[PDB]
Design a protein around this ligand. Structure first.
Ligand SMILES: O=P(O)(O)OC[C@H]1O[C@H](OP(=O)(O)OP(=O)(O)O)[C@H](O)[C@@H]1O
Ligand SMILES: O=P(O)(O)OC[C@H]1O[C@H](OP(=O)(O)OP(=O)(O)O)[C@H](O)[C@@H]1O
Ligand SMILES: Oc1ncnc2cn[nH]c12
Ligand SMILES: Oc1ncnc2cn[nH]c12
Ligand SMILES: [Mg+2]
Ligand SMILES: [Mg+2]
Ligand SMILES: [Mg+2]
Ligand SMILES: [Mg+2]
Lengths: 193, 187
């Protein structure tokens, strides 16, 4: 990728880490007696970014016999830009109630944590049986508000990453690898506005 | 797979076919001058079933250097027997306007085609540079309204399939393979 400063994780690496995280989620939830139809683990996939991670994660979870039920929601905060708007917009909420069910919010990245903080708070008041979060990437040095996900596949430095569902101006979501976007590429693009 | 009466496609067979379809889409768009930001191929992923197909397809398209823009839409039924035009309530629509853009609607399965036909014409009215559809599975014999998808990964018999995004009672979407649900189970 000529627009990439560097590749952080290859597709193979992500796949490996996701399987390991799935095995852990499976072990941690064993006592919950998850069962299809009556007791699935509800995966709240945060669109658009989480589509890819969710697709691969639910499969890895299936490998470990963890039955799941997908709920796709859509939340917006960065829009076409590089930084948090400071506002988290709910564009689509869950189709069904989460009350009394085990819920795992599936996110591609946590940076300032405004998104996950807003989401966790919203669902928390809905009284699910349990509420946890799994993030693909944790940009630890990017927090504006505190938040610690229950499961983290990878930690990354303070650089704008793209690929594997993550975008910059709704571009690059389709990359198989996670890469650092060159500032000369986003600067030119940002300049175009 | 005790709940399945037969295996239709394994994850590896699906993976392969998707790549062949992506290579074709790429060739068919080679003369569209597609470029990121300004002229990407807009994939309108119809939730919830196509989320998995969309994830692997966009990656296959990326293998062929096609710049894509992902859109996810959520539709709902107005009520029972309130239409036959396949009209659906739009709970979540495209973020960007498709007007003047090359669009590809992504679906997991087409059978009756009532909803997909409705969606096709709806987006068609928004005036995109072009509009095509790609469906992973097609029950050609199930049509309730005439409809032909532009790209299809596999034609299948009239049996209820699950897995690879497809569900039954919101169950089994996470399967890596596409299997036929034991008719008894479906009831
Ligand atoms: O921790 P935060 O600073 O809140 O940043 C993380 C959020 O920002 C991104 O979403 P975005 O708002 O870009 O929407 P998107 O998923 O559709 O790309 C990313 O997908 C997370 O949802
Ligand atoms: O062509 P037809 O026989 O009418 O059916 C096709 C539609 O039904 C299914 O969606 P569903 O209503 O099941 O929504 P879902 O994708 O969220 O499961 C499938 O995923 C297509 O959207
Ligand atoms: O590095 C990054 N890439 C894509 N989206 C986001 C959001 N926060 N931080 C990001
Ligand atoms: O076989 C099938 N499996 C899952 N959803 C649908 C819709 N129509 N036909 C289906
Ligand atoms: Mg997001
Ligand atoms: Mg974004
Ligand atoms: Mg569907
Ligand atoms: Mg369904």
């Amino acid at each position: 990728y000529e627009f990439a400063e560097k590749i952080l994780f290859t597709e193979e690496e992500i796949r490996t880490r996701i399987k390991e995280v799935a095995k852990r989620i499976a072990d941690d939830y064993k006592g919950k007696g998850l069962r299809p139809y009556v007791n699935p683990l509800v995966l709240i996939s945060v669109l658009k970014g989480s589509f890819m991670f969710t697709a691969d994660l639910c499969r890895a979870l299936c490998d470990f016999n963890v039955p799941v039920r997908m709920e796709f929601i859509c939340v917006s905060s960065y829009g076409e830009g590089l930084t948090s708007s400071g506002q988290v917009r709910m564009l689509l909420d869950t189709r069904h109630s989460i009350e009394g069910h085990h819920v795992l919010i599936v996110e591609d990245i946590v940076a300032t944590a405004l998104t996950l903080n807003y989401l966790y708070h919203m669902y928390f008041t809905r009284r699910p049986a349990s509420l946890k979060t799994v993030v693909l990437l944790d940009k630890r040095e990017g927090r504006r508000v505190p938040f610690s996900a229950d499961y983290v596949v990878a930690n990354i430095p303070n650089a704008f990453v793209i690929g594997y569902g993550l975008d910059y101006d709704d571009t690059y979501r389709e990359l198989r690898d996670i890469v650092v976007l060159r500032p000369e590429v986003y600067a030119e693009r940002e300049a175009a506005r």
